Write a protein that holds these residues in place. Structure first.
Motif, PDB file in Angstrom:
ATOM      1  N   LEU A   1       3.719   7.777   3.722  1.00 44.27           N
ATOM      2  CA  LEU A   1       3.385   7.507   5.123  1.00 44.27           C
ATOM      3  C   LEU A   1       2.468   8.581   5.695  1.00 44.27           C
ATOM      4  O   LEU A   1       1.501   8.275   6.411  1.00 44.27           O
ATOM      5  CB  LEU A   1       4.658   7.415   5.961  1.00 44.27           C
ATOM      6  CG  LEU A   1       4.432   7.215   7.467  1.00 44.27           C
ATOM      7  CD1 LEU A   1       3.594   5.969   7.748  1.00 44.27           C
ATOM      8  CD2 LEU A   1       5.768   7.144   8.208  1.00 44.27           C
ATOM      9  N   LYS A   2       2.771   9.850   5.425  1.00 45.08           N
ATOM     10  CA  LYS A   2       1.906  10.911   5.927  1.00 45.08           C
ATOM     11  C   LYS A   2       0.501  10.792   5.346  1.00 45.08           C
ATOM     12  O   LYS A   2      -0.495  11.015   6.054  1.00 45.08           O
ATOM     13  CB  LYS A   2       2.516  12.280   5.632  1.00 45.08           C
ATOM     14  CG  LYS A   2       3.701  12.609   6.535  1.00 45.08           C
ATOM     15  CD  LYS A   2       4.333  13.945   6.188  1.00 45.08           C
ATOM     16  CE  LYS A   2       5.475  14.273   7.141  1.00 45.08           C
ATOM     17  NZ  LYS A   2       5.027  14.361   8.561  1.00 45.08           N
ATOM     18  N   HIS A   3       0.397  10.423   4.065  1.00 45.24           N
ATOM     19  CA  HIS A   3      -0.921  10.246   3.464  1.00 45.24           C
ATOM     20  C   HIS A   3      -1.672   9.094   4.110  1.00 45.24           C
ATOM     21  O   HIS A   3      -2.879   9.196   4.349  1.00 45.24           O
ATOM     22  CB  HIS A   3      -0.805  10.011   1.960  1.00 45.24           C
ATOM     23  CG  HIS A   3      -2.128   9.783   1.298  1.00 45.24           C
ATOM     24  ND1 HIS A   3      -2.985  10.813   0.972  1.00 45.24           N
ATOM     25  CD2 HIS A   3      -2.759   8.640   0.936  1.00 45.24           C
ATOM     26  CE1 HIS A   3      -4.078  10.316   0.420  1.00 45.24           C
ATOM     27  NE2 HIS A   3      -3.966   9.000   0.385  1.00 45.24           N
TER      28      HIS A   3
ATOM     29  N   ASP B   1       9.673  10.553  -0.996  1.00 45.73           N
ATOM     30  CA  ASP B   1       8.527   9.835  -1.550  1.00 45.73           C
ATOM     31  C   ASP B   1       7.868   8.945  -0.508  1.00 45.73           C
ATOM     32  O   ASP B   1       6.637   8.864  -0.438  1.00 45.73           O
ATOM     33  CB  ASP B   1       8.954   8.991  -2.749  1.00 45.73           C
ATOM     34  CG  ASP B   1       9.191   9.821  -3.985  1.00 45.73           C
ATOM     35  OD1 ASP B   1       9.053  11.059  -3.896  1.00 45.73           O
ATOM     36  OD2 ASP B   1       9.510   9.233  -5.043  1.00 45.73           O
ATOM     37  N   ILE B   2       8.672   8.243   0.290  1.00 49.32           N
ATOM     38  CA  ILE B   2       8.117   7.378   1.325  1.00 49.32           C
ATOM     39  C   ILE B   2       7.511   8.212   2.444  1.00 49.32           C
ATOM     40  O   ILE B   2       6.464   7.862   3.004  1.00 49.32           O
ATOM     41  CB  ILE B   2       9.200   6.412   1.843  1.00 49.32           C
ATOM     42  CG1 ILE B   2       9.646   5.484   0.712  1.00 49.32           C
ATOM     43  CG2 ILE B   2       8.687   5.611   3.050  1.00 49.32           C
ATOM     44  CD1 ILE B   2      10.894   4.624   1.027  1.00 49.32           C
TER      45      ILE B   2
ATOM     46  N   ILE C   1      11.179   5.022   9.464  1.00 48.57           N
ATOM     47  CA  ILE C   1      12.639   5.021   9.391  1.00 48.57           C
ATOM     48  C   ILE C   1      13.103   5.512   8.024  1.00 48.57           C
ATOM     49  O   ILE C   1      13.976   6.381   7.916  1.00 48.57           O
ATOM     50  CB  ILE C   1      13.184   3.610   9.699  1.00 48.57           C
ATOM     51  CG1 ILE C   1      12.930   3.260  11.172  1.00 48.57           C
ATOM     52  CG2 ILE C   1      14.660   3.494   9.295  1.00 48.57           C
ATOM     53  CD1 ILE C   1      13.244   1.797  11.533  1.00 48.57           C
ATOM     54  N   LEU C   2      12.506   4.971   6.961  1.00 46.87           N
ATOM     55  CA  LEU C   2      12.911   5.329   5.609  1.00 46.87           C
ATOM     56  C   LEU C   2      12.518   6.757   5.257  1.00 46.87           C
ATOM     57  O   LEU C   2      13.199   7.401   4.453  1.00 46.87           O
ATOM     58  CB  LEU C   2      12.289   4.355   4.611  1.00 46.87           C
ATOM     59  CG  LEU C   2      12.739   2.900   4.723  1.00 46.87           C
ATOM     60  CD1 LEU C   2      11.804   2.020   3.905  1.00 46.87           C
ATOM     61  CD2 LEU C   2      14.164   2.787   4.220  1.00 46.87           C
ATOM     62  N   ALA C   3      11.429   7.257   5.850  1.00 47.66           N
ATOM     63  CA  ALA C   3      10.904   8.578   5.514  1.00 47.66           C
ATOM     64  C   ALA C   3      11.909   9.687   5.807  1.00 47.66           C
ATOM     65  O   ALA C   3      11.877  10.735   5.152  1.00 47.66           O
ATOM     66  CB  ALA C   3       9.591   8.819   6.271  1.00 47.66           C
TER      67      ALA C   3
ATOM     68  N   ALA D   1       0.819  -1.210   0.000  1.00 49.35           N
ATOM     69  CA  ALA D   1       0.000   0.000   0.000  1.00 49.35           C
ATOM     70  C   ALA D   1       0.855   1.263   0.000  1.00 49.35           C
ATOM     71  O   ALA D   1       0.458   2.276  -0.588  1.00 49.35           O
ATOM     72  CB  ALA D   1      -0.945  -0.005   1.201  1.00 49.35           C
ATOM     73  N   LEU D   2       2.022   1.228   0.637  1.00 49.17           N
ATOM     74  CA  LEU D   2       2.925   2.371   0.683  1.00 49.17           C
ATOM     75  C   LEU D   2       3.891   2.422  -0.497  1.00 49.17           C
ATOM     76  O   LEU D   2       4.699   3.355  -0.570  1.00 49.17           O
ATOM     77  CB  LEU D   2       3.716   2.354   1.996  1.00 49.17           C
ATOM     78  CG  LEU D   2       2.888   2.533   3.270  1.00 49.17           C
ATOM     79  CD1 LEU D   2       3.713   2.167   4.504  1.00 49.17           C
ATOM     80  CD2 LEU D   2       2.323   3.953   3.383  1.00 49.17           C
ATOM     81  N   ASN D   3       3.836   1.435  -1.400  1.00 43.27           N
ATOM     82  CA  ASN D   3       4.702   1.379  -2.582  1.00 43.27           C
ATOM     83  C   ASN D   3       6.179   1.354  -2.194  1.00 43.27           C
ATOM     84  O   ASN D   3       7.017   2.004  -2.820  1.00 43.27           O
ATOM     85  CB  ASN D   3       4.412   2.535  -3.545  1.00 43.27           C
ATOM     86  CG  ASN D   3       4.951   2.280  -4.940  1.00 43.27           C
ATOM     87  OD1 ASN D   3       5.022   1.132  -5.391  1.00 43.27           O
ATOM     88  ND2 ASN D   3       5.344   3.346  -5.627  1.00 43.27           N
ATOM     89  N   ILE D   4       6.506   0.587  -1.150  1.00 42.51           N
ATOM     90  CA  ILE D   4       7.883   0.427  -0.687  1.00 42.51           C
ATOM     91  C   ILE D   4       8.396  -0.929  -1.152  1.00 42.51           C
ATOM     92  O   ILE D   4       7.719  -1.947  -0.971  1.00 42.51           O
ATOM     93  CB  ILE D   4       7.985   0.544   0.841  1.00 42.51           C
ATOM     94  CG1 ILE D   4       7.490   1.907   1.319  1.00 42.51           C
ATOM     95  CG2 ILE D   4       9.432   0.349   1.303  1.00 42.51           C
ATOM     96  CD1 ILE D   4       7.464   2.011   2.854  1.00 42.51           C
ATOM     97  N   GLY D   5       9.590  -0.945  -1.738  1.00 47.86           N
ATOM     98  CA  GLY D   5      10.146  -2.195  -2.239  1.00 47.86           C
ATOM     99  C   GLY D   5      10.626  -3.083  -1.098  1.00 47.86           C
ATOM    100  O   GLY D   5      11.394  -2.648  -0.230  1.00 47.86           O
ATOM    101  N   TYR D   6      10.181  -4.337  -1.099  1.00 53.70           N
ATOM    102  CA  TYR D   6      10.590  -5.298  -0.083  1.00 53.70           C
ATOM    103  C   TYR D   6      10.741  -6.663  -0.737  1.00 53.70           C
ATOM    104  O   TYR D   6      10.275  -6.906  -1.855  1.00 53.70           O
ATOM    105  CB  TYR D   6       9.590  -5.380   1.091  1.00 53.70           C
ATOM    106  CG  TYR D   6       8.271  -5.997   0.680  1.00 53.70           C
ATOM    107  CD1 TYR D   6       8.034  -7.365   0.821  1.00 53.70           C
ATOM    108  CD2 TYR D   6       7.274  -5.211   0.108  1.00 53.70           C
ATOM    109  CE1 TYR D   6       6.827  -7.927   0.415  1.00 53.70           C
ATOM    110  CE2 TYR D   6       6.077  -5.755  -0.291  1.00 53.70           C
ATOM    111  CZ  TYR D   6       5.852  -7.107  -0.134  1.00 53.70           C
ATOM    112  OH  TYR D   6       4.652  -7.631  -0.549  1.00 53.70           O
ATOM    113  N   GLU D   7      11.393  -7.561  -0.007  1.00 53.38           N
ATOM    114  CA  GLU D   7      11.577  -8.948  -0.411  1.00 53.38           C
ATOM    115  C   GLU D   7      11.266  -9.827   0.792  1.00 53.38           C
ATOM    116  O   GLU D   7      11.818  -9.610   1.873  1.00 53.38           O
ATOM    117  CB  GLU D   7      13.008  -9.172  -0.905  1.00 53.38           C
ATOM    118  CG  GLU D   7      13.171 -10.303  -1.889  1.00 53.38           C
ATOM    119  CD  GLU D   7      14.517 -10.255  -2.595  1.00 53.38           C
ATOM    120  OE1 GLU D   7      14.601  -9.638  -3.678  1.00 53.38           O
ATOM    121  OE2 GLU D   7      15.493 -10.817  -2.053  1.00 53.38           O
TER     122      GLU D   7
END
Ligand SMILES: [Cl-]
Ligand SMILES: [Cl-]
Ligand SMILES: [Cl-]
Ligand SMILES: [Cl-]
Lengths: 161, 161, 161, 163
Positions: free
Chosen positions: D144-146, D139-140, D132-134, D28-34
């Motif tokens: 997150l704020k949204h 962009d992150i 943490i990433l923000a 939902a946050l469009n953050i790349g993960y594995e």
């Protein structure tokens, strides 16, 4: 009826517990309002609600929350009205987190805490009634009748079999 | 058959647990009477029940309650007869509140406490029988036979499946 | 196959848990005998079982019990063989009573305790195999193969999606 | 496409029933993960290799979920200086109390940032990784704020529990 009790809760799911407080207040003919106020998702609303409760005529607040339950304590920090806390049963720790995060307030800001779960919701309404009964003779009469009837029902059904 | 045991409980729902005490007493042919006596809803009846128990010929009281369980301790405050406490399983805390509110009596007024739940109901009957067996040879014979057959049933089925 | 492990439990219901120890021993090709031995209902049998285990060739005892679990500790008091304890999940306290009544032995008589429930039953078999593997190269090879296969299975399936 | 900034790891396939909610939140946050199964008890060597490689691969946060005597978060934090978040998985016998204490009670020297037991902690591990990433990725930060602004407005829009 004058709205004397604010019955508030952190989320819609908490209503499955606090509806029993509302049912008890209805049975006692005590006016109340029920509203969702989230300490974590609507922190500014919590402040507005607490700041204005006394001026709107509320005399007791019943606040229910589960988990790391901060709603009752933060309302008590922001209004001098007596705040009752209902620990909602949590899925993982059966409301033990709810209970400790409500009852263990440090000295200075109190929350009067009731049993975990539905029992505590019912008892929060009965306790708010006891508070209001010191002021309002009709509420005192209603509470005493409730207690008298609940006593007589057990007396008249003594056999478990 | 004299009625030697008062089997009491705070509410009708507690009977789902304490009925197993009654079944055990019936197996041992020990006379008892079962009654709903609520510390919280019938406090006056609790005191009368405890005051009169000895004069009615009762010799042991088995009291079951759940949650903040005050029935055993208040009976033991009001009669010198031995009181056995059965902690009833509670929905929120699995009878941990029941257990601590029964067993942790301060020095001066004892309650002999059994296991949480059905196991404690059965054992409260067996323990009342053990108390009575010091005075009544017929009850001693019944209890020894019960224990011997309980032992033989396990010995006769040594292999699991 | 020589019988190296006694797998004992206080009641038939405990076998729902300890059967997973038996399954693991079967997979490792380790000989065992499974038997109901009750600390509370067959105390004399417990003493005879413990006394005779070493002369019978048993080298490890796995004992499962629930609630106020006395079987592993009393076996350990009566034989010098290593005794492993499996706390069986209890209906009222989720095996917390089982765990404390097994692991908290005072100094002098040990019980090697595994996880509550099915996980501990499986691990009691694996730990008994670890004990026997110091003696028996065939068992050491079987245990190492079991551990290698379970490692490789996770490595071969790294994607949870 | 998206560079992988979060390693989402768990001790067993059954833990995925909890950590899938972390994955859903990162989506939902469009953050790349594995997402990967890394077992402290069954693949100890792979745990060390995974932790050793994390920084050079470009990962900046590790979310590790485990239940019972949960050693995966702490041992990963012992082997990489990246921040490691711990998700206590609800256990069948002790309701995740063992999971929680074996993750959060790290001795001084090696930290694990611990979240709530269960699904709530999986969701919050993703939100905390985003926080943490923000600090580094605007962009992150905006995503997150949204997310927070939307969840606030939704409660404000639904004040009446009687519907
Ligand atoms: Cl707000
Ligand atoms: Cl009364
Ligand atoms: Cl015997
Ligand atoms: Cl490995």
């Amino acid at each position: 009826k004058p709205i004397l009790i604010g019955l508030i809760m952190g989320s819609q799911s908490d209503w499955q517990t606090l509806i029993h407080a509302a049912h008890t207040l209805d049975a006692l003919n005590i006016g109340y309002e029920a509203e969702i106020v989230s300490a974590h998702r609507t922190p500014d609303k919590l402040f507005r609600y607490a700041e204005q409760a006394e001026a709107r005529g509320l005399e007791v607040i019943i606040a229910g929350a589960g988990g790391a339950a901060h709603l009752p304590g933060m309302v008590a920090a922001k209004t001098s009205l007596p705040v009752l806390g209902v620990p909602v049963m949590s899925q993982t720790l059966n409301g033990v987190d709810s209970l400790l995060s409500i009852v263990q307030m440090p000295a200075g800001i109190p929350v009067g805490t009731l049993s975990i779960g539905k029992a505590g919701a019912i008892n929060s309404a009965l306790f708010a009634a006891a508070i209001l009964a010191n002021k309002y003779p009709d509420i005192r009469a209603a509470l005493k009748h409730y207690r008298e009837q609940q006593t007589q029902k057990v007396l008249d059904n003594p056999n478990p079999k």
